[PDB]
């Protein structure tokens, strides 16, 4: 959210570094980004079972 001239709240993509790098294609993947933000996930066992 950023303030518009009139005073209304506008919704911008954002320049957040993880987001900026991801969106620009400079560095990063969504799966990798979620690794610092969202809960990791399921691991594989060595047998391959989850």
């Amino acid at each position: 959210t950023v303030i518009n001239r009139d005073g209304q709240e506008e919704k911008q993509v954002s320049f957040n570094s993880i987001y900026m790098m991801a969106d620009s294609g400079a560095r990063g993947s969504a799966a990798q980004i979620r690794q610092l933000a969202g809960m990791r996930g399921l691991m594989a066992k060595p047998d391959g079972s989850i």
């Binding site: 990798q32 690794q35 990791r40 399921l42 691991m43 594989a44 989850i50």
Partner: peptide, 7 residues
């Protein structure tokens, strides 16, 4: 986890 279900 990441790569290789690891990551």
């Amino acid at each position: 986890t990441x790569x290789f279900x690891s990551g």
